[PDB]
Design a binder for this molecule. Sequence first.
Ligand code: NA
Length: 240
Amino acid sequence: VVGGTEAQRNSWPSQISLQYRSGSSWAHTCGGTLIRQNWVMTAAHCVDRELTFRVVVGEHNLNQNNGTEQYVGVQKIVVHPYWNTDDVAAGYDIALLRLAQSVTLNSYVQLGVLPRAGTILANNSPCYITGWGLTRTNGQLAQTLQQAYLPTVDYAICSSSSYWGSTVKNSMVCAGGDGVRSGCQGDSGGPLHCLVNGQYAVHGVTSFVSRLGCNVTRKPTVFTRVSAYISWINNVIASN
Ligand code: NA
């Protein structure tokens, strides 16, 4: 997250860190949202590589013991069957991860609530992106979980020629684009939390930013629209 602030450690208890095994250690690669005690929602592109993955719930500082973490292996990966890794603009950037164990819930570890199917946010709706991704274009990962306030940019504006044009689909949510605040590499797969009827819900799964940089004016961060995939999610969980 470029232009973020440090999150309070109990603000976003559904955020997870998706990590892969790297030598004798683990490296953060993406975010995710805990959606059942044994299921995480993330981006398909985060799991393209043939790596050993784990999830960390209750994580705040990637580089320090928080006293709240639970570490769990990924047992099964179910990528959306229409996903194509060389065509992120087509959409379908979503995957579900079945965890090897069911995590225990507490103020640091909670299920993300998802929007009702079909819900589309009005332009300029209030949302926060969260993650440990780069804090500058071509920078480095955050140590502590960051949040940034990123208002939605509706489809009509986001798919206009000076924004994303054809590359953004109605199956996506755009947010931000102010040139200061954005998602960045390492935020992919995590939540976009939007405040609706008094309750935050996870409306987006972080998918992509501009090849020209993270915080680029009129290139809002682009998310998979969770509300387009409610039946898919429920079908995967029911059949696994
Ligand atoms: Na930690």
